[PDB]
């Protein structure tokens, strides 16, 4: 009946941004006002839809993409952005319709001695297409000499860890992000407001 927003927003662990999660939400009633009052969100904006009108709308499905990035990178989760995250990890289209929601998760995702579980992709041959996911771990050839499985200068394992520790500056602290895509198909709606 009620949409399982808790499974996404309150998951004990989030995905690394390079392997960002997508949860298909269907056949349920969604109260986005309650969701807005669910926590102390630092980001809760929408594109192509009005936030305060979400409870009046019906969608065919809703897709919740979720991941962790550092604070300074939240700005990249938006149309028309560039940077390591937008280029190589998670890319929204220029005509994105949906909502971006982000909150500081330093209390959940940082640990003394470092939490290294959250990773990001630092190198890639080309930029991701919108909503593309790349989970490959092939050695990146940044130079003219082929790597052939050997790591070294200009031959990089393409993922790096955030290594969140609890006293990082806020720009280097972990932020959990949920991007809600509201799918409109020429089919009966399955996700409506109250």
């Amino acid at each position, epitope marked *: 009946n009620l949409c399982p927003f808790g499974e996404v927003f309150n998951a004990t662990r989030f995905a690394s941004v390079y392997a960002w999660n997508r949860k298909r939400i269907s056949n349920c009633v969604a109260d986005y006002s309650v969701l807005y009052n669910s926590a102390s969100f630092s980001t809760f904006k929408c594109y192509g839809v009005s936030p305060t009108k979400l409870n009046d709308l019906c969608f065919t499905n809703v897709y919740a993409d979720s991941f962790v990035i550092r604070g300074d990178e939240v700005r990249q989760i938006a149309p028309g952005q560039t940077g390591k995250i937008a280029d190589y990890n998670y890319k929204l289209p220029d005509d994105f319709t949906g909502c971006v929601i982000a909150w500081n998760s330093n209390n959940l995702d940082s640990k*003394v*001695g*470092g939490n*290294y579980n959250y*990773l990001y992709r630092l190198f890639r041959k080309s930029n991701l297409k919108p909503f593309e996911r790349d989970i490959s771990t092939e050695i990146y050839q940044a130079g003219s000499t082929p790597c052939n499985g050997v*790591e070294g200068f200009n031959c990089y*394992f393409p*993922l*790096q860890s955030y*290594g969140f520790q609890p006293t990082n500056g806020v720009g280097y602290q972990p932020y959990r992000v949920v991007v809600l895509s509201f799918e409109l198909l020429h089919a009966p709606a399955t996700v409506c407001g109250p």
Partner: nanobody, 111 residues
């Protein structure tokens, strides 16, 4: 294996020794450190270091010192004031998506 240990052996209580470890893969932004397993006991952390910080087991604080050369992807464990309890198999360790372990090096401290 990706982690190659060196050092170890037999020492008297109060003595010292130094363990070394070289990785053939890059642990840049990832942790490297040392674990140990006494006979009939569970393998436990000794020390680790990385961009996330440096942590020691309570029993070795003030006696063991971990260091790391990021350029060579090497990690070291200076073991001072060795105690009989410090006798164990010591493993070089890293984490990069999965755990990486060295071969295991016997350290024996007797009086």
């Amino acid at each position: 294996l990706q982690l190659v240990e060196s050092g170890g052996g037999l020492v008297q209580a109060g003595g010292s020794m130094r363990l070394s470890c070289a990785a053939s893969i890059s642990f840049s932004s990832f942790p490297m450190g040392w674990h140990r397993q006494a006979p009939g006991k569970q393998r436990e952390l000794v020390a680790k270091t990385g961009i996330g910080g440096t942590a020691y087991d309570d029993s070795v604080k003030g006696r063991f010192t971990i260091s790391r050369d990021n350029t060579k992807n090497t990690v070291y464990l200076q073991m001072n004031s060795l105690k009989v309890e410090d006798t164990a198999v010591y493993y070089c360790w890293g984490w990069r998506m999965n755990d990486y372990w060295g071969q295991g090096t016997q350290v024996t401290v007797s009086s």
